[PDB]
Structure 1
Amino acid sequence: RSIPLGVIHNSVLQVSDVDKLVCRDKLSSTNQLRSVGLNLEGNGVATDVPSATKRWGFRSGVPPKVVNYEAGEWAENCYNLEIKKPDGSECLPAAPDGIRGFPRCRYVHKVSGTGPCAGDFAFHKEGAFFLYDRLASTVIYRGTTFAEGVVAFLILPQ
């Protein structure tokens, strides 16, 4: 029931927390705290949209959640989805105010069409996040470029 906090010296990455942070460990400014978004792509992670959707699914009853992150990495593949329900209305919610596309994509799978939309929101089946511009959401937003990813919290040196 506690979010891990990474502590780095020169290159010592020890997964600690304040449930350990030795009385010699120095946190002198809040500027030393950073959150980072890392991408989930590479070998064994399919890139084409038909294979990619297998990692996501529609679900109702679960409210979407957002968390900020301050830095991330260049993504080789990003996604940008637009989906009409069978009756023609919109399947994905509009991007909330201040949520912009993931800012550094080599390539964007930007696609549009219609589908069954069997739920209120599209989630990540592996429990990862959809990374947008320094905001990570549990959910896919309409016409908005994302990378798949996860977040870590760090203490940086002075």
Structure 2
Amino acid sequence: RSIPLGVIHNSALQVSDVDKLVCRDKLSSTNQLRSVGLNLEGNGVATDVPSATKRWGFRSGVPPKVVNYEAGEWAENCYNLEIKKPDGSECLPAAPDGIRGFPRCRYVHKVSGTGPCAGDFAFHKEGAFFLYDRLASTVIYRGTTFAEGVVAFLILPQGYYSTTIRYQATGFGTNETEYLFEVDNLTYVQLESRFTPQFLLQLNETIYTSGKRSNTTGKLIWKVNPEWAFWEXXXXX
């Protein structure tokens, strides 16, 4: 059937039945209709970078599509990708004119690195959208901050802080992807799924203050010994 439209009846939200007509329903101006976007975050999906990237994939033959939405949710986690093939060619297209990043992100997970990118565009494997500034797209644009989400349409009844977290990635978009969390351009930490955004920032500050940054010209990589929703080489132990 057609695109569902949400309405409030009997102190509950419901989908309006097109086949039946309710004359008590009053629509007095187009201002009473709204499109809203809701974040996958809010349904309990894992938001760590290894888990989130496994939901995206490259595909050819399918033209991208964009739909607008008027209101959105403050996100805890957004993503921003700069992925090249091993030969240095870009994997994601430049943001089209008028598509800016998602406007409210507590943590922006910026991921750089390489992968095969066996497809013209990167889609959401579960059918969700990539949410930008009041535009929802079926594909990922290069270096543009997005939140994962879905769109709803409604009949209405008649400070801000952001912190970037940088990662390096090899084999992006595959079964065997490697992720490093970046402390400086020469100090990295082996990323795991269990590492929450707050834990990575503390790990960064403790590495800076304890002098565990690389004091050579080469690349230093740490591993961390093993020692709920957000709203509710070497070693180190």
TM-score by length of 1: 0.93
Partner deviation per Cα, 1:92-122 (whole Å, 9 max, x = no partner): 0001000000001111101111111110000
Residues in 2 aligned to 1:71 and 1:150: alpha-carbon distance in whole angstroms: 12
Query: Tell me, which stretches of 5 or more residues in structure 1 are unaligned?
Result: none
Question: Max radius of gyration: which structure?
Answer: 2
How many residues get paired? 157
TM-score by length of 2: 0.63
Partner deviation per Cα, 1:56-102 (whole Å, 9 max, x = no partner): 11100000000000001011100000111122111100010000000
The 5-angstrom pairing of residues 36-51 of structure 1 reads 36-41=36-41, 45-51=45-51
Query: Tell me, which stretches of 5 or more residues in structure 2 are unaligned?
Result: 158-237
Kept in 2: contact 1:7–1:155 (CA 8 A): yes
Deviates further, 62-71 or 6-15: 6-15
Distance 1:90 1:105, change over 3 A: same
Distance 1:135 1:43, change over 3 A: closer
Deviates further, 45-54 or 123-132: 45-54
Kept in 2: contact 1:6–1:17 (CA 8 A): no
Partner deviation per Cα, 1:24-75 (whole Å, 9 max, x = no partner): 1101101100000000015752222222111111100000000000001011
Deviates further, 100-109 or 12-21: 12-21
Greater strand percent: which structure? Answer: 1
Residues in 2 aligned to 1:54 and 1:28: alpha-carbon distance in whole angstroms: 45
Kept in 2: contact 1:9–1:156 (CA 8 A): no
Deviation at 1:11, TM superposition (A): 4.0
